[PDB]
């Protein structure tokens, strides 16, 4: 029971944290020459490491050593808070945590491949979409600056048909008779080119704006679907961890 305690794993610093990763406040487990064992507790997305020292029979954190075992010391603190030991540890040891029962061994191993294939298929779908997202962010903001540039282009052209109206209609009254229909037709020709060109430009900006909404539309749909893939991708990953624990080289075939 000392070794067959559910929460006693006996593992390196790294694979503790990967087992503590993404669990809630209060979750725990227990773990070289510095002391003996280590209570690695999780608190609000951060791992607190608490040393267990063993000397003349007793086990404990520091001075109040009157606990005759490793399995003794944890049962007390699963009920009670750690604040009285060290002031700012107002959190209990609440989640002392450590799938088909396919006692078949080989059939658990096959399921590990099925889930790991699904997971891997899932991770690509997520990666595909993340890149579509980030492209689409770029393609949108280029669409936006294009609209600005369009709008600034138009201002320059609107200004142009204004700029000519000053000087072109200064020329009508300053002469009129000399090149009446001759000079004014060929000034009218320019003006009607200039305004139809503004008309083409405005129609070009418009046509981009309708594409921008359809882009911004697709962008939402990508995000939507990312957010629906994400929680599946966790639970699929989390089942794969539990199957791979329950088993434990040969594996690398199933993965």
């Amino acid at each position: 029971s000392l070794q067959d305690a559910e929460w006693y794993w006996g593992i390196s610093r790294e694979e503790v944290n990967e087992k503590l990763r993404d669990t809630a406040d209060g979750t725990f487990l227990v773990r070289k020459m510095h002391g003996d064992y280590t209570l690695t507790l999780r608190k609000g997305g951060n791992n607190k490491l608490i040393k267990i020292f063993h000397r003349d029979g007793k086990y404990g954190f520091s001075d109040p050593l009157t606990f005759s075992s490793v399995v003794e010391l944890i049962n007390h603190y699963r009920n009670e808070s750690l604040a009285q030991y060290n002031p700012k540890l107002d959190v209990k040891l609440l989640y002392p945590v450590s799938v088909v029962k396919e006692d078949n061994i080989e059939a658990v191993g096959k399921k590990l491949h099925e889930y790991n294939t699904q997971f891997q298929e899932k991770s690509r779908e997520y990666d595909r979409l993340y890149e579509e997202y980030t492209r689409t962010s770029q393609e949108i903001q280029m669409k936006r600056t294009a609209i600005e540039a369009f709008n600034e282009t138009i201002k320059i052209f609107e200004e142009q048909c204004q700029t000519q109206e000053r000087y072109s209609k200064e020329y009508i009254e300053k002469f009129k008779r000399e090149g009446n229909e001759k000079e004014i037709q060929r000034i009218m020709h320019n003006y009607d080119k200039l305004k139809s060109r503004i008309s083409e430009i405005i129609d070009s900006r418009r046509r981009l704006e309708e594409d921008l909404k359809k882009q911004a539309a697709e962008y939402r749909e990508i995000d939507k679907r990312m957010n629906s893939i994400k929680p599946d991708l966790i639970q699929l990953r989390k089942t794969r961890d539990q199957y791979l624990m329950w088993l434990t080289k040969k594996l690398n075939e199933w993965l």
Partner: peptide, 23 residues
């Protein structure tokens, strides 16, 4: 084209346009 006599010598002028950064 019309209205040539309203233009200055070419040297008294610079080109401007709208770039791809919208400035």
């Amino acid at each position: 084209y019309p209205l040539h006599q309203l233009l200055q010598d070419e040297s008294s002028y610079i080109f401007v346009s709208v770039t791809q950064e919208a400035e």
